[PDB]
Ligand binder design. Sequence first.
Ligand SMILES: O=c1ccn([C@@H]2O[C@H](COP(=O)(O)OP(=O)(O)O)[C@@H](O)[C@H]2O)c(=O)[nH]1
Ligand SMILES: [Mn+2]
Lengths: 87, 304
Amino acid sequence: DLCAAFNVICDNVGKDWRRLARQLKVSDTKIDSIEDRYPRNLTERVRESLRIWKNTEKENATVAHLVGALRSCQMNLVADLVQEVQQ
Amino acid sequence: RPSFAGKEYSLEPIDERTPILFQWFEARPERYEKGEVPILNTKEHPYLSNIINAAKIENERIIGVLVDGNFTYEQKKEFLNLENEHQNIAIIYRADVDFSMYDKKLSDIYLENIHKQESYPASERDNYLLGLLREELKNIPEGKDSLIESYAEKREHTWFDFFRNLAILKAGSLFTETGKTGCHNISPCSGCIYLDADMIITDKLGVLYAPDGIAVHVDCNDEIKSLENGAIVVNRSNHPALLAGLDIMKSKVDAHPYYDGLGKGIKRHFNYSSLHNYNAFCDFIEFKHENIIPNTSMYTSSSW
Ligand SMILES: O=c1ccn([C@@H]2O[C@H](COP(=O)(O)OP(=O)(O)O)[C@@H](O)[C@H]2O)c(=O)[nH]1
Ligand SMILES: [Mn+2]
């Protein structure tokens, strides 16, 4: 379920992934680690940031929360597709 | 003397006439009542009140507020009135500030990056990114081929993060170039004390001290430290850590003004790498002061 949401985000979010990471409150030092581990793979950086958010928020890591963050950092079309694939 | 990564630094003084800078970028100026200054000022987020009280306490400094948003003519009068009522408050509109010395064309950023990706072996490059760059290059808005203009248009948190870094690069000159009364005392190369509006000043700050002239807020949530941009102090304009961050914003196509423009800038400046210990670096660079109650939105909610 979250996995399908992550797939929609990775399919659609490129250059602006860090804005979503910051909206998700992914820490500065975790972004350092993502970049070190995937220096030549932008899509994998997005996915790793989502995975870190999930591990950090535990049970509060929900599709609803993910959609609220997308809308909040003005990725409303991505949020639309996420909600589309969910229902 | 403080040290990090094998180098020692001086604790540089930030003298007691250094201006204090707040920021309020308003995406929804229509949310305010007629006759209200359009800076958030609710019981939950008493931010205009906090700023006014800072200016009241620090009566020997100028308190600036860098503002942006589609303010109405009546709102602009309310800002004038605010300045008339509080002698040492300067309202500084983003659009009135000369940032042109920091700009770069987006087309140049993309082209440089295309050549960089092409210089890698095909099995070792970011093929997806190389395709995005070629499409980004084709879709630059007419008249908007400008890093700075591309952020001026945004209405999410990177809008305020990006201009916060540039305003602190300007530092004293942000204030001197307004021509406002009282700013006669500041020099163009003076430093700057940047605060979030929920950073509560309780008494005069006096002289501040920062390793090599820069220090930033460190958040500590659940024994986890994080460098943060909600307070930033510099002892001079064009501080080299912020110049390093601007260079990254000019070079790294997926850069973020917080993680990269502030965070990576200060890390490069002090040669912090994956070799080093992040918590030790936080300890080294931390700005904290007994007369500031930090980040009081932690008791209510984030306003973004
Ligand atoms: O609509 C907004 C929301 C916040 N801010 C800036 O963001 C800072 C941090 O806001 P806050 O303390 O509420 O949030 P936090 O980042 O600590 O969660 C504020 O002081 C303002 O400088 C802004 O300019 N416009
Ligand atoms: Mn806060």
